[PDB]
């Protein structure tokens, strides 16, 4: 099982759109990633990745 599992390949795109635009609107990273959901890219990165 993998419910939307996410890769490492995978986290490198979404820390560079992150990082490149911010944690705003997740909707403009989400167009940028088909398939991730805002709320997958949000839970992805502010519940996990979050160098603070």
Same mark, same amino acid.
């Given at each position: ?9 995978? &986290?490198?795109k ?9 944690? &705003? &609107? ?11 959901? &805002? ?14």
């Amino acid at each position: 099982l993998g419910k939307t599992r996410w890769t490492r390949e995978e &986290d490198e795109k979404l820390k560079k759109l992150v990082e490149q635009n911010g944690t &705003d &609107d997740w909707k403009v990273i989400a167009n940028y990633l088909p398939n991730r959901t &805002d709320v997958q890219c949000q839970h992805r990165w502010q519940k996990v990745l979050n160098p603070e």
